[PDB]
Amino acid sequence: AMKKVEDGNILVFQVSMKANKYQIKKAVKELYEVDVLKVNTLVRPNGTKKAYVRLTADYDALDIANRIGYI
Amino acid sequence: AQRVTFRRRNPYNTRSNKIKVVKTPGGILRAQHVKKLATRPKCGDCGSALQGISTLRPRQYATVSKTHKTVSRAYGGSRCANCVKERIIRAFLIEEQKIVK
Amino acid sequence: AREITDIKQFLELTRRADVKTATVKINKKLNKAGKPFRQTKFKVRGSSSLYTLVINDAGKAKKLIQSLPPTLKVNRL
Amino acid sequence: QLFVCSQRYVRIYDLSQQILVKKLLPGARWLSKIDIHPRGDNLIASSFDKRVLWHDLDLASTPYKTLRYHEKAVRSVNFHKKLPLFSSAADDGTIHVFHATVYDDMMKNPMIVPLKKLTGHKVINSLGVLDAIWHPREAWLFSAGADNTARLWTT
RNA sequence: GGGUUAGUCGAUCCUAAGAGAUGGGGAAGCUCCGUUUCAAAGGCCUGAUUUUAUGCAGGCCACCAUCGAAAGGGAAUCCGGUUAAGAUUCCGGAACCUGGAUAUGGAUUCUUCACGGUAACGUAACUGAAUGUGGAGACGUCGGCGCGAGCCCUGGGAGGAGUUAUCUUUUCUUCUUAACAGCUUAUCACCCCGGAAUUGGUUUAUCCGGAGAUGGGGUCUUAUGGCUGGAAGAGGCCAGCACCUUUGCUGGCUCCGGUGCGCUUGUGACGGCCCGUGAAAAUCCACAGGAAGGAAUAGUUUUCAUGCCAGGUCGUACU
Numbered sequence: 001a002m003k004k005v006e007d008g009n010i011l012v013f014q015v016s017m018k019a020n021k022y023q024i025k026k027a028v029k030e031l032y033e034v035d036v037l038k039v040n041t042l043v044r045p046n047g048t049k050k051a052y053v054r055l056t057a058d059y060d061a062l063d064i065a066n067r068i069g070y071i
Numbered sequence: 072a073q074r075v076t077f078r079r080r081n082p083y084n085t086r087s088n089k090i091k092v093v094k095t096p097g098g099i100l101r102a103q104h105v106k107k108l109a110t111r112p113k114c115g116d117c118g119s120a121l122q123g124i125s126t127l128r129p130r131q132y133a134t135v136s137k138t139h140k141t142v143s144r145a146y147g148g149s150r151c152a153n154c155v156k157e158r159i160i161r162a163f164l165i166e167e168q169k170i171v172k
Numbered sequence: 173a174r175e176i177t178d179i180k181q182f183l184e185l186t187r188r189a190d191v192k193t194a195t196v197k198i199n200k201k202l203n204k205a206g207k208p209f210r211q212t213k214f215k216v217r218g219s220s221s222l223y224t225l226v227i228n229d230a231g232k233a234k235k236l237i238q239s240l241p242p243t244l245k246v247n248r249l
Numbered sequence: 250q251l252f253v254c255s256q257r258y259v260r261i262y263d264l265s266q267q268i269l270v271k272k273l274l275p276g277a278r279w280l281s282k283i284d285i286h287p288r289g290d291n292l293i294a295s296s297f298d299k300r301v302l303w304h305d306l307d308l309a310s311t312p313y314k315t316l317r318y319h320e321k322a323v324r325s326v327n328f329h330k331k332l333p334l335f336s337s338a339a340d341d342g343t344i345h346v347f348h349a350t351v352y353d354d355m356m357k358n359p360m361i362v363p364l365k366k367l368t369g370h371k372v373i374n375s376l377g378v379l380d381a382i383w384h385p386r387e388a389w390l391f392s393a394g395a396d397n398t399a400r401l402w403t404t
Numbered sequence: 405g406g407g408u409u410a411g412u413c414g415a416u417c418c419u420a421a422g423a424g425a426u427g428g429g430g431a432a433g434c435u436c437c438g439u440u441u442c443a444a445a446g447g448c449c450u451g452a453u454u455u456u457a458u459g460c461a462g463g464c465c466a467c468c469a470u471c472g473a474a475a476g477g478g479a480a481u482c483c484g485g486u487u488a489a490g491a492u493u494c495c496g497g498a499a500c501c502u503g504g505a506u507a508u509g510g511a512u513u514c515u516u517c518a519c520g521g522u523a524a525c526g527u528a529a530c531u532g533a534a535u536g537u538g539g540a541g542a543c544g545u546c547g548g549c550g551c552g553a554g555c556c557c558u559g560g561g562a563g564g565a566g567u568u569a570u571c572u573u574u575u576c577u578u579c580u581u582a583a584c585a586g587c588u589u590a591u592c593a594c595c596c597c598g599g600a601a602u603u604g605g606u607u608u609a610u611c612c613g614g615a616g617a618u619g620g621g622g623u624c625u626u627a628u629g630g631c632u633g634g635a636a637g638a639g640g641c642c643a644g645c646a647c648c649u650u651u652g653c654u655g656g657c658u659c660c661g662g663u664g665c666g667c668u669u670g671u672g673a674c675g676g677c678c679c680g681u682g683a684a685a686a687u688c689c690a691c692a693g694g695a696a697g698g699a700a701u702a703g704u705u706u707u708c709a710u711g712c713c714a715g716g717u718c719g720u721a722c723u
Contacts, residue, residue, distance in 0.1 A: 008495060020716055040409040079413055083475050092554045096483060097639060098580040115538035122624040123525060129540045130479055132689040137707050149538050149691040173634040174585060177270040180307010256520040257527055274528055276511050278519020311510045
């Protein structure tokens, strides 16, 4: 998931199961003040929902990764 | 010598599920699924294909402009032209015969 | 992708104000089968489609690079 | 290049490449004539529906400017080969003379200014001026009339 | 322990044989019959409905729940890269589809709802409600004949690999181009001119012509092919440097052709066969009709162009 930040410009979050692409796109934009290009999702084998969230070319995925904590 | 798969999960040769073998920029053969062929629109009277109308699938007519689907004569989109000719001749003579009655 | 022949039409697309970036490209090719010549390709990133302009002569190519606006981003090769 | 004017369109062919390179859309049903600006990047077209269209060939395929200075069908449009002048001639028996400055290198579109309405030709059977042509050097225009005359227009 | 990422691949939607609530009717009863039937089975337009002065009036339309296909029907995505294990779903670039807001450009209008062509029909556009009619969806199998693709076969040149006791200008291998877009292209068919026995045209297959052949000139479909854009920046084949490194870094070449009762497959126009003549529905478009609505100081066109926003749920590993 470190690899997808630099190459992809992609944040990887864990999400609630009841969430969908629209809610993940809305909630990332609300908290961190970032424009989302697209969201993909998959349910993990352990049963949580992983969410790959690519941002636009303007807003850097690297900078938000410092601000959040995990880096 | 090089051999080729179905891309999609249907493994049977149905009317929908057809293949063309294509040489790529990678330099290997690959399947490409061809969509089913558009028939011509017909003239609903004489029963033949009618000119200046595009051959598309029925949904695909919604994308395309008006001048593709129509021709400029009255009854142009839906008539043979020769069968439009007849009914203008017929309408005129029978209407004239009605005064003679 | 969409080729353009005309030179006037290309200058309108640069001033259209959705076009964030352009890119210039240079290719070695051989005319007829006599001698080499240095082709150019001025591509411009529209929102829907990629408009492009093939100029064969090297003299007209160098004036065209200057004739681009400065505010537009340009990217070589 | 060869420019071919149909009733509705102007198509420009490259005779060397043997291909169509541009199709102009004047928006008329009855084009009558074209002329090409001497520096090669602009065209004017006359129409029987009373319009003259100026096309800036690099700018857009539709007309840059629509000129409405005639009461009747326009039969001829003609550029001067050296001076920044052009004319339209119509079945109203009138010739209209225009100035046009073209900016070859810089990002400015043509400046077109009407100059003069030339009257004198007699209208015969709904026909007026049938043809016209500029002198190659002088600001002199020659016109051909349905009235059996040709005429020289001068400063 | 890790691993399965989709507006575009499926499911979902449509109907098939069939299944099955409701209204009803049988049955002591578990329930059985029946499926548009002996049902008050909803949803659209107009209204100072012109007086009763603070209460709904006048009309229009006509069949029927739902389930039933991961092979039938059906909006739309391709190339290249990448992982210990994933990809038409990730990354990079390049596309398209559906629905919705509107705003500039063009077009059209003072003859308000485009012009051109004898005609087949043409173009970047070029209002349109009720209702009605038409087409697409939409379909057997066999036979040869034409056209295309992929493969096979084959020559020159530029690289690489092997053989070399003797012979071999030798043997093998690389030299590729996606969806999508814009131009252009074909049998059939159609139009105009003209008037055919001294009968002519013509398929491998003998059918066609005064209901207008032969001939000459056109118009149309775009399966398919071609040309440029996509796109060489990609990929492939080679060469050489840096070096404990989990490492980069830089050069070239990527070209021009040919053959066919060839093989596989797609498609075209025909022919044979039947006391067999070889699904339906969703969905989309067109045509007839003209309710009405729009300008001369600024409107009408979002079926022309460009631009803005959005695309949920579940399956996706492997045999």
